[PDB]
Amino acid sequence: IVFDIFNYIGIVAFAISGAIKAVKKGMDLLGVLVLGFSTALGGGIISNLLLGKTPPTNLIYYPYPITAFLASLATFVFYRIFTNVGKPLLYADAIGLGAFASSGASLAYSVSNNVILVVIVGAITAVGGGVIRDILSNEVPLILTREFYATTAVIGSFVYFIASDLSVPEDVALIVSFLITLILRILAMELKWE
Amino acid sequence: IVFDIFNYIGIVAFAISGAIKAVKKGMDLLGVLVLGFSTALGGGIISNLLLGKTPPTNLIYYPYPITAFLASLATFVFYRIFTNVGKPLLYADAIGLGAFASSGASLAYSVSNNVILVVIVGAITAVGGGVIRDILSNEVPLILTREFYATTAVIGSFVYFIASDLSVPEDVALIVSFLITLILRILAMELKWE
Amino acid sequence: IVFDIFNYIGIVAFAISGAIKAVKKGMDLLGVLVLGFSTALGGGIISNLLLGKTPPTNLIYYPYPITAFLASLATFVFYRIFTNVGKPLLYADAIGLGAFASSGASLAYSVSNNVILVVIVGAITAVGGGVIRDILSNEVPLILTREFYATTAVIGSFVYFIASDLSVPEDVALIVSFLITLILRILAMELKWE
Ligand code: NA
Ligand code: NA
């Protein structure tokens, strides 16, 4: 059940991050929806393609794109009203990074217990939405500008792999991977490691 | 037969748009061919990947890439001679948007009657070539800069789905989806909605 | 055995090119690793997706990503020490272009003897890593800025196809395709064709 919850958490968090980016770039409602939608679902779609899972879950399981839409719309309405309140793009991205590094590693592990597949596909699941967000926004992505960003995704997917290898129950393994990924991002941002 | 015709119309229209972009960015013959080729075939390739259709039709069915090549070459020669005549990049893109939103939704519908799959894959088929064109050109894509652009693709794929759901013959369903997509773009551009 | 060697040559060469790009853009160790890793393995991953080969070889065959990592790390250490020695990004890219145009055409040919599939997938394998490198770096890719770049990849994959069609042994066919691709790039760069 933790797996199902993490999919929704990551979709909402990445939708908020993509919608925030759109608002900061001056876009209006429909363009904000496009960037939130793409950021929220891109990581899962890329991950499914790499694992040969077609059609991708994000394009068939109705609650996922509906959630991406509604979270992006809520973000637009929020900042259309409250134009001068802070825009935590990086914290929204970091929560999504933990939710998808853990859930993305879990999906890769179900295909094969190859550590390279699990760690790299999990990390691609985690950063993929934000990479799409940043490329569509015509700027250098966070995976290059933030020194510890992509490696923290790699670490979070690796701790999922290790926990699963050590027979840790899937719910616990997802939670621990999420926690380490998010804590490492919080430390990077709050301690000015980047 | 409308399906087969729309594939050629969209390939030519998107090749012209990518070749025009290349000419406006100062590229020469071979670079113009690369951008026209990529714009014309990218949407179909991405769509095939999302539906698990490999190898993609655009890389096996000879008339499609030959058409992409010849339309891109014709565009280069035209503007090499007539340097000062108008460059209708957006109208070429809009005709392709209608041809591929309709044909791309048709392909997705043949895989499954899931409305989310049909609408989103159809829209990705429609905008994908231009997104590739704009990313390769190092600028923000039309799906973000034009407020009604991506939503009009979504609308056109949705009207295909509705028409097919209502048992409208495939030729008519493709034509109506094409028409609505193109008319909505014409209205957006001519009435300064964006 | 030439096929296996070319995979390592192209991975090392593209890793060096992506790591050099990262160093020139001011990134530190971990960001240099991310760009080298992505450049070295991206072409193979895209090529596998187009041919329906999942999971991609670069994410399961341990020596490939290990080689990408080690070559990127060696490049960072080299230029961290020797900051003022030349940075042959384009020569590293050109060696990879020949190694992957040949090996990528070979992989496509094993799926089908369709000349369009072999030539275009082979060329996408050859340029894909550098296109990813350039998009992540927020600039126009070499396939658009260098007039003879993408066409030379197309030529190299085509000479592989012709040699294989003429029953030339695979080792020789790979070597000849590699040679023509690399020689054509050397001529383009040394004779100021671009
Ligand atoms: Na840019
Ligand atoms: Na860019």
Numbering used by the authors:
A (entry chain A), B (entry chain A), C (entry chain A): 7 to 200
Give passages from the manuscript.
As evidenced by the fact that their genetic ablation led to compromised K+ permeability and Ca2+ release across the SR/ER membrane, TRICs play important roles as counter-ion channels for balancing the charge potential change during Ca2+ release/uptake in the intracellular stores. In this study, we analyse the structure and function of a bacterial and an archaeal TRIC channel. Both proteins have similar structures, consisting in symmetric trimers of 7-TM subunits, each composed as inverted quasi-repeats of triple-helix bundles (THBs) plus an added TM segment (TM7). Many other trimeric channels, including ATP-gated P2X receptors, acid-sensing ion channels and the mechanosensitive Piezo1 channels, form central ion-conducting pores at the three-fold axes of protomer association; by contrast, the prokaryotic TRIC trimers have three pores as calculated by the HOLE programme, one through each protomer.
